[PDB]
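In practice, a research group might receive sequence data for several interacting partners and want a quick structural hypothesis before committing to experiments. The following worked case mirrors that situation: the sequences arrive first, and a predicted assembly follows.
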Amino acid sequence: SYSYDAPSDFINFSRQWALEDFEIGRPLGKGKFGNVYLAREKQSKFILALKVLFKAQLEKAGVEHQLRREVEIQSHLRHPNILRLYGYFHDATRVYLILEYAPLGTVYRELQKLSKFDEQRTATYITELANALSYVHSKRVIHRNIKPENLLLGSAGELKIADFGWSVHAPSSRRTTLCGTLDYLPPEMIEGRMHDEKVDLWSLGVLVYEFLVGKPPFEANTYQETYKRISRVEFTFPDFVTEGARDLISRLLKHNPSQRPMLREVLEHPWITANSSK
Amino acid sequence: SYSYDAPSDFINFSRQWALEDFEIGRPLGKGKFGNVYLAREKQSKFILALKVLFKAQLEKAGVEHQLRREVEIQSHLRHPNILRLYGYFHDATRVYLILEYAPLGTVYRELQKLSKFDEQRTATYITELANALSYVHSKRVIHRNIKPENLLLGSAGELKIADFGWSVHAPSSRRTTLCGTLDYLPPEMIEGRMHDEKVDLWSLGVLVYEFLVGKPPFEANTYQETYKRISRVEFTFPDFVTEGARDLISRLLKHNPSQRPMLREVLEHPWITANSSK
Ligand SMILES: Nc1ncnc2c1ncn2[C@@H]1O[C@H](COP(=O)(O)OP(=O)(O)NP(=O)(O)O)[C@@H](O)[C@H]1O
Ligand SMILES: Nc1ncnc2c1ncn2[C@@H]1O[C@H](COP(=O)(O)OP(=O)(O)NP(=O)(O)O)[C@@H](O)[C@H]1O
Ligand SMILES: [Mg+2]
Ligand SMILES: [Mg+2]
Ligand SMILES: [Mg+2]
Ligand SMILES: [Mg+2]
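A structural hypothesis for the assembly, expressed as tokens:
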């Protein structure tokens, strides 16, 4: 049940994929269902990332259909600021995603090192991110999981959107995380609200805030308090956040999704154009 | 922060409550934040249930405000088929709910013993449940957690609705269980859909099915499959479920909440009146 509408054939980086095509290196990270390994295609010596997923853990979590969406959606996207998915294959026990290797790690880790980004580094990242999301949204795809952990850095330090495991086509009501006993709840208590590409515009506004401040705007001790802060749009600005940054953040963190700007208004925002290098 | 609009004064079952007012017996059950104990008020020797909740665990889960709703809502309800909450009190570390003692246990356990209920036992329970939910809904309260574990049995074998920890006033969009990182999700991805008292009509239909069949209609191996079965109303009937029972169940398990019958149509349904003893 692992036949996707996505490439599975050998690629000459200089016949179906096989595990014997790859040399394996250090783990680049640990996912929930397996590790992502630094890898190399043997013939071309091309460096890639090999995401290994265990079929047993995929099925016990019932996530086999969202994996299909991740593979099919990401493999058909071609953008300099989006992580390539060159193809996939599977054997008896594992599924392998052949991913573009991002050498400079996650924006999450870079934010940990630098504590907070200056306005120019932030505006440049937001330009790259808005460009990539514009391309994603032109395909009617919602990423729905935009956050520093899922933003990788290319060899030139540019942003690469990664982790399309939650991506869907707009509009959608699909949930992302399900917890608790559902057996007795009606549909109106388990189904998510209808949402579209404006979801990623909100996440983009959260990123502008955390890039400049060093912490997310709705941070709280419990899930419930964070839930209320988000639902009621309860956040405040430290005094060092400039007026132009406060304007862009406030325009993006709108409870009404239709009131959030188009990505082109973000790219042309005065604070962005004044501080971005791209 | 544990001052509720609910009784906290001593009651003569034959001055504020104190833990010294009660003799403690065996645990009647184990909740998520503490045990429910068989207890006895010393002066009157009146047998009750003492629900003990640890403030430290309540706050680390951020559930202090839903506890207020549970205490305030349940303590103002007076119905023979609803578990009384006589009052509450708290000390430095714990909150105590003084509950009516239900001698014959949960419907859950009775269903485990009998495997499945005959049509007459089922119809009688549904009559008692519909009567109690009619009273609850007359107060514009949604229980939102109707299931066999939360239905207790009085000394005469009658149903008693229990566990109002999820109860709210209609209409509502409050979630019941929150899981996963919310920090980057927009409101439309974390907020629940608007719902009202029709929620409990769906749960009632699930109960009719499980009472007669012995298993819930949307049972599945994963949360995701169960989610899809509920959202798409995917269930089938074993051949022994009679035509009248199939009619009542199908009328209640409507995806559109407004298409579900009033509780009075349930109480007057031909299958109910033909088989209920109440
Ligand atoms: N192409 C890549 N290049 C470099 N590092 C990568 C790449 N893909 C993944 N990683 C690293 O591996 C980690 C886990 O990958 P990820 O795709 O997020 O797994 P996941 O299970 O789908 N999501 P997560 O729960 O965060 O692990 C990431 O946080 C990165 O640090
Ligand atoms: N008044 C009562 N009389 C008799 N048994 C009771 C009473 N209240 C609770 N119990 C038992 O104690 C168990 C736990 O009580 P409950 O009120 O459900 O705790 P909870 O944490 O709010 N929900 P749960 O997660 O199921 O424990 C129940 O399943 C019953 O078996
Ligand atoms: Mg991730
Ligand atoms: Mg993920
Ligand atoms: Mg319970
Ligand atoms: Mg409960």
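Before designing any experiment, note the following. Residues 55 and 93 of chain B are 5 Å apart (CA to CA). Chain B is about 35% helix and 15% strand.
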